[PDB]
Motif scaffolding. Structure first.
Motif, PDB file in Angstrom:
ATOM      1  N   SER B 107       0.800  -1.223   0.000  1.00 37.24           N
ATOM      2  CA  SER B 107       0.000   0.000   0.000  1.00 37.24           C
ATOM      3  C   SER B 107       0.838   1.281   0.000  1.00 37.24           C
ATOM      4  N   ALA B 108       2.157   1.145   0.100  1.00 36.50           N
ATOM      5  CA  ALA B 108       3.022   2.320   0.087  1.00 36.50           C
ATOM      6  C   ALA B 108       2.739   3.116  -1.184  1.00 36.50           C
ATOM      7  N   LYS B 109       2.364   2.405  -2.243  1.00 34.71           N
ATOM      8  CA  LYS B 109       2.061   3.000  -3.539  1.00 34.71           C
ATOM      9  C   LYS B 109       0.855   3.936  -3.517  1.00 34.71           C
ATOM     10  N   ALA B 110      -0.050   3.694  -2.574  1.00 33.45           N
ATOM     11  CA  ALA B 110      -1.259   4.486  -2.435  1.00 33.45           C
ATOM     12  C   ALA B 110      -1.186   5.355  -1.188  1.00 33.45           C
ATOM     13  N   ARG B 111       0.010   5.856  -0.891  1.00 33.66           N
ATOM     14  CA  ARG B 111       0.226   6.716   0.268  1.00 33.66           C
ATOM     15  C   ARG B 111      -0.219   6.043   1.567  1.00 33.66           C
ATOM     16  N   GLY B 112      -0.156   4.716   1.594  1.00 35.31           N
ATOM     17  CA  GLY B 112      -0.527   3.963   2.784  1.00 35.31           C
ATOM     18  C   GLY B 112      -1.995   3.601   2.953  1.00 35.31           C
ATOM     19  N   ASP B 113      -2.848   4.090   2.061  1.00 37.32           N
ATOM     20  CA  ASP B 113      -4.286   3.822   2.157  1.00 37.32           C
ATOM     21  C   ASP B 113      -4.672   2.351   1.981  1.00 37.32           C
ATOM     22  N   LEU B 114      -5.455   1.842   2.925  1.00 39.25           N
ATOM     23  CA  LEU B 114      -5.926   0.462   2.891  1.00 39.25           C
ATOM     24  C   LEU B 114      -7.405   0.406   2.536  1.00 39.25           C
ATOM     25  N   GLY B 115      -8.036   1.576   2.458  1.00 44.33           N
ATOM     26  CA  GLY B 115      -9.451   1.639   2.130  1.00 44.33           C
ATOM     27  C   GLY B 115     -10.337   1.421   3.341  1.00 44.33           C
ATOM     28  N   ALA B 116     -11.647   1.372   3.117  1.00 40.78           N
ATOM     29  CA  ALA B 116     -12.598   1.167   4.203  1.00 40.78           C
ATOM     30  C   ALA B 116     -12.854  -0.319   4.406  1.00 40.78           C
ATOM     31  N   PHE B 117     -12.920  -0.730   5.665  1.00 43.98           N
ATOM     32  CA  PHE B 117     -13.148  -2.127   5.989  1.00 43.98           C
ATOM     33  C   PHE B 117     -14.013  -2.278   7.237  1.00 43.98           C
ATOM     34  N   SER B 118     -14.510  -3.491   7.456  1.00 43.35           N
ATOM     35  CA  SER B 118     -15.343  -3.782   8.614  1.00 43.35           C
ATOM     36  C   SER B 118     -14.606  -4.821   9.443  1.00 43.35           C
ATOM     37  N   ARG B 119     -15.131  -5.140  10.621  1.00 42.74           N
ATOM     38  CA  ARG B 119     -14.485  -6.141  11.457  1.00 42.74           C
ATOM     39  C   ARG B 119     -14.527  -7.484  10.744  1.00 42.74           C
ATOM     40  N   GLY B 120     -13.472  -8.270  10.924  1.00 47.26           N
ATOM     41  CA  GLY B 120     -13.404  -9.574  10.297  1.00 47.26           C
ATOM     42  C   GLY B 120     -12.455  -9.666   9.118  1.00 47.26           C
ATOM     43  N   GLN B 121     -12.022  -8.528   8.584  1.00 44.83           N
ATOM     44  CA  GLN B 121     -11.128  -8.531   7.430  1.00 44.83           C
ATOM     45  C   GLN B 121      -9.631  -8.454   7.757  1.00 44.83           C
ATOM     46  N   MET B 122      -9.251  -7.548   8.653  1.00 47.84           N
ATOM     47  CA  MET B 122      -7.842  -7.377   9.001  1.00 47.84           C
ATOM     48  C   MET B 122      -7.403  -8.213  10.196  1.00 47.84           C
ATOM     49  N   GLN B 123      -6.092  -8.375  10.340  1.00 46.01           N
ATOM     50  CA  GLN B 123      -5.554  -9.129  11.461  1.00 46.01           C
ATOM     51  C   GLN B 123      -6.089  -8.461  12.716  1.00 46.01           C
ATOM     52  N   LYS B 124      -6.522  -9.270  13.671  1.00 45.98           N
ATOM     53  CA  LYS B 124      -7.122  -8.757  14.894  1.00 45.98           C
ATOM     54  C   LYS B 124      -6.480  -7.552  15.577  1.00 45.98           C
ATOM     55  N   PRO B 125      -5.160  -7.593  15.832  1.00 42.27           N
ATOM     56  CA  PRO B 125      -4.527  -6.449  16.502  1.00 42.27           C
ATOM     57  C   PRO B 125      -4.707  -5.155  15.703  1.00 42.27           C
ATOM     58  N   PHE B 126      -4.574  -5.272  14.390  1.00 47.91           N
ATOM     59  CA  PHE B 126      -4.725  -4.136  13.490  1.00 47.91           C
ATOM     60  C   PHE B 126      -6.172  -3.662  13.538  1.00 47.91           C
ATOM     61  N   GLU B 127      -7.094  -4.614  13.438  1.00 45.13           N
ATOM     62  CA  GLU B 127      -8.517  -4.315  13.468  1.00 45.13           C
ATOM     63  C   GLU B 127      -8.906  -3.620  14.773  1.00 45.13           C
ATOM     64  N   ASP B 128      -8.511  -4.196  15.905  1.00 41.27           N
ATOM     65  CA  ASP B 128      -8.859  -3.599  17.192  1.00 41.27           C
ATOM     66  C   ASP B 128      -8.344  -2.173  17.330  1.00 41.27           C
ATOM     67  N   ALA B 129      -7.110  -1.932  16.896  1.00 39.21           N
ATOM     68  CA  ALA B 129      -6.535  -0.593  16.986  1.00 39.21           C
ATOM     69  C   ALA B 129      -7.298   0.382  16.088  1.00 39.21           C
ATOM     70  N   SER B 130      -7.578  -0.035  14.860  1.00 30.41           N
ATOM     71  CA  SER B 130      -8.287   0.821  13.913  1.00 30.41           C
ATOM     72  C   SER B 130      -9.666   1.270  14.390  1.00 30.41           C
ATOM     73  N   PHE B 131     -10.448   0.345  14.944  1.00 31.31           N
ATOM     74  CA  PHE B 131     -11.784   0.689  15.415  1.00 31.31           C
ATOM     75  C   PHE B 131     -11.796   1.437  16.743  1.00 31.31           C
ATOM     76  N   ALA B 132     -10.663   1.445  17.440  1.00 35.09           N
ATOM     77  CA  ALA B 132     -10.562   2.144  18.717  1.00 35.09           C
ATOM     78  C   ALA B 132     -10.062   3.575  18.498  1.00 35.09           C
ATOM     79  N   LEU B 133      -9.545   3.845  17.303  1.00 36.03           N
ATOM     80  CA  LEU B 133      -9.047   5.176  16.972  1.00 36.03           C
ATOM     81  C   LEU B 133     -10.187   6.120  16.609  1.00 36.03           C
ATOM     82  N   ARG B 134      -9.998   7.400  16.903  1.00 34.81           N
ATOM     83  CA  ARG B 134     -10.987   8.411  16.552  1.00 34.81           C
ATOM     84  C   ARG B 134     -10.585   8.882  15.155  1.00 34.81           C
ATOM     85  N   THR B 135     -11.530   9.418  14.392  1.00 31.88           N
ATOM     86  CA  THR B 135     -11.209   9.885  13.049  1.00 31.88           C
ATOM     87  C   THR B 135     -10.119  10.946  13.123  1.00 31.88           C
TER      88      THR B 135
END
Lengths: 7, 155
Positions: B107-135
């Motif tokens: 994703s370095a090619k897209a300035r790091g963007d991974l796009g929009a996702f829901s729970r169940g797609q990313m590795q758990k630690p990554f997922e938990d951190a992402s949903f706990a972050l504020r916009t």
């Protein structure tokens, strides 16, 4: 993991 | 909490109070995103995030193998991650630029963007951190099987 201070 | 101490807090789920070894000043740490902030801080269905990944190996293959692309240790990877966090927080570097420059993820090619996702797609630690972050907020070092990440929630 021991956290780092914010600044 | 104890009779001989000042009472205290809320700290939304995930947060805890800590002390700066350097100044003795209190700060707050989120053990889900691993982010640290001075201000007392005091979930959604989909989130969009960008990240900067720093890979590391602990592999140790036999002589016959080709040299591996990633040879740095976890310790060295964490040092790089902490340095990037400091430069981003200090306004010395922009998240997107550093991701584009140093991220080991495709994703370095897209300035790091991974796009929009829901729970169940990313590795758990990554997922938990992402949903706990504020916009608009950034994580601290997050460890997954892919390596160490710095996550920025953009939506």
């Amino acid at each position: 993991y021991s956290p780092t201070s914010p600044s | 909490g104890s009779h001989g101490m000042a009472d205290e807090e809320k700290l939304p789920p995930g947060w805890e109070k800590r002390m700066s070894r350097s100044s003795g000043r209190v700060y707050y740490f989120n053990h889900i995103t691993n982010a640290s902030q001075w201000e007392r801080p005091s979930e959604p269905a989909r989130v969009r995030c960008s990240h900067l990944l720093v890979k590391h190996s602990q592999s140790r293959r036999p002589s016959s193998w080709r040299q591996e692309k990633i040879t740095r240790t976890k310790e060295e990877a964490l040092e790089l991650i902490n340095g990037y966090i400091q430069k981003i927080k200090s306004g010395e570097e922009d998240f997107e630029s550093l991701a584009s420059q140093f991220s080991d993820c495709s994703s370095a090619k897209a300035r790091g963007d991974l796009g929009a996702f829901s729970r169940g797609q990313m590795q758990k630690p990554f997922e938990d951190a992402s949903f706990a972050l504020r916009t608009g907020e950034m994580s601290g070092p997050v460890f997954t099987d892919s390596g160490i990440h710095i996550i920025l929630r953009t939506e």
